Amino acid sequence: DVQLQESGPSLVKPSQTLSLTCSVTGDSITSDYWSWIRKFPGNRLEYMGYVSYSGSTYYNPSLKSRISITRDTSKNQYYLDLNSVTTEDTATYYCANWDGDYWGQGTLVTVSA
């Protein structure tokens, strides 16, 4: 099976850029489609974006252009950068395969002064 794992900070300050890594094992990111999804502490789910097999990225307009998704095929990893974070960005960040079967364990990121 595919395994996905997010890594990155647990705590960031307002206006910092939040940068996360998703490490994928057991399937290649140069085929299929790969996603970032977050769960707010009140349980609301938001689809942030995804990157296609050829590197084409799609972003939720809710993110008002603060989001970048990139990849490093040589390590089977992809990345999320989210600029100018505020307390509204406290959430659990998941990477997932775009079919929805395989998700990371999620990483909780808290934004605080």
Binding site: L45, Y47, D101, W103
Partner: protein, 107 residues
């Protein structure tokens, strides 16, 4: 964007009774509607794809029906480990969006 509305937001049921959970879309999404179960501090778990598609490993008591703008997740004879949150998600148009969820509680 497509707005998914889930009603009711809370349903309390007694174990062994059946339930129907509603997800309505603001515009037509064909069959491109998926259902997830959500329990504490875990990733969402996929239950049903493409409105009615059953998937390996998910108990047979879960099924989905509907099309267009009106969808239902049915759980036949609810079990206590089914209590928790349920979300629908459309993939018909970007951005993909989730309903606000229905919490299933023990009556």
């Amino acid at each position: 964007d497509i707005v998914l509305t889930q009603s009711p937001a809370t349903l309390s049921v007694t174990p062994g009774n059946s339930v129907s959970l509603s997800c309505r879309a603001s515009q037509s999404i064909g069959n491109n509607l998926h259902w997830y179960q959500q329990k504490s501090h875990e990733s969402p778990r996929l239950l049903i794809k493409y409105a009615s598609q059953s998937i390996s490993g998910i108990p047979s008591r879960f099924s989905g029906s509907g099309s267009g703008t009106d969808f239902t997740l049915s759980i036949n004879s609810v079990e206590t480990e089914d209590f928790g949150m349920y979300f629908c998600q459309q993939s018909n148009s970007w951005p993909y969006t989730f309903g606000g969820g229905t919490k299933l509680e023990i009556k």
